[PDB]
């Protein structure tokens, strides 16, 4: 069965005055593979994928600021805050060239960093990634009213901050197979106190949906423009029915994005890592062996 444990030795680095935790396993030389999680997860979401890659490549998986075992400064936790912290995390570890493996808000961070630093990105593996959602009709109907309610300061904060719905509800509805109590407890751990749930509510308020927020839409459109032109090697995982990336969108992208290979993981919603970690891990490892790294 799918592993529930998190055996990785903790590492911490100081980044803009705050401590960030990260996983760091695998051989010291070579090009490192940088795994970036999204909302409402942490490096825990990569626990069953990293073991396929760590035999042959260094795997670095940070916890975003305010998440996982990272510190919880009093921020708004805008996407811009995550950009500043991830930029400085990357520099604090002295990373030069990397391969990215990215998901959800980690994908916005990784594509935005790669577009700004294309010489330092040797490949991107991505899944269930942030793209502009043109209208609410392109958000999955089964989740539409709740995401609309999340994007308010009254109902949305009641649900996500007071009641922890992003953890208790949205996270299971983003995984096809059932999550076990131990897994739920690993995801709950950083957010036991309601005040620490700020990032969980700011993230859905930052999603580029129906033109809002305009600044995030523009930034995401720009990295998608880059992705459609850049020769960077690309590996796209997708599932059925997906959430951010429906199967037809994935098929489009695989042919449209240069140097892109698509992998169907089977049934999946948003956290594809929880529905088929062994395929995702093994395919990343295989794909890495084809890159000039
Ligand atoms: Cl979100």
Numbering used by the authors: 3 to 295
Extract from the study:
The self-labeling protein tags (SLPs) HaloTag7, SNAP-tag, and CLIP-tag allow the covalent labeling of fusion proteins with synthetic molecules for applications in bioimaging and biotechnology. The three most popular SLPs are HaloTag7 (HT7),14 SNAP-tag (SNAP),15 and CLIP-tag (CLIP)16. To guide the selection of an SLP–substrate pair and provide guidelines for the design of substrates, we report a systematic and comparative study of the labeling kinetics and substrate specificities of HaloTag7, SNAP-tag, and CLIP-tag. We complement these kinetic studies by reporting crystal structures of HT7 and SNAP covalently labeled with rhodamine-based fluorophores, providing a detailed understanding of their substrate preferences.
HT7 was engineered from a bacterial dehalogenase (DhaA from Rhodococcus sp.), an enzyme that can hydrolyze halogenated alkanes. Inactivating the second catalytic step of its enzymatic reaction (mutation H272N in HT7) abolished the hydrolysis of the ester formed with an active site aspartate residue and created an SLP. HT7 reacts specifically with chloroalkane-PEG (CA) molecules resulting in covalent bonding of the alkane chain to the reactive aspartate and release of a chloride ion. In addition to the conventional α/β-hydrolase topology, HT7 features an extra capping domain made of six α-helices (Hlx4–9) that partially cover the catalytic site and form an entry channel for the CA substrate. After reaction, the PEG-alkane ligand is buried in the protein, while the xanthene moiety of the dye lays on the distorted α-helix 8 (Hlx8) in a conformation partially constrained by the crystal packing. The alkane-fluorophore is positioned by the Hlx6–turn–Hlx7–turn–Hlx8 motif of the HT7 capping domain from which T172Hlx8 and, to a lesser extent, T148Hlx6 form hydrogen bonds with the oxygen and the nitrogen of the amide bond linking PEG-alkane and fluorophore. CA-TMR and CA-CPY have similar conformations in both structures with only minor differences in their torsion angles. The direct comparison of SNAP and HT7 reveals that HT7 features significantly higher labeling rate constants with various fluorescent rhodamine derivatives. These differences in reactivity can be explained by specific interactions of the rhodamine’s xanthene ring with selected surface residues of HT7. The mechanism underlying the equilibrium shift from the spirocyclic nonfluorescent to the zwitterionic fluorescent form is not yet fully understood, but our results indicate that the planar, zwitterionic form of rhodamines (e.g., TMR and CPY) features energetically favorable interactions with the HT7 surface, thus potentially favoring this state of the fluorophore when attached to the protein.
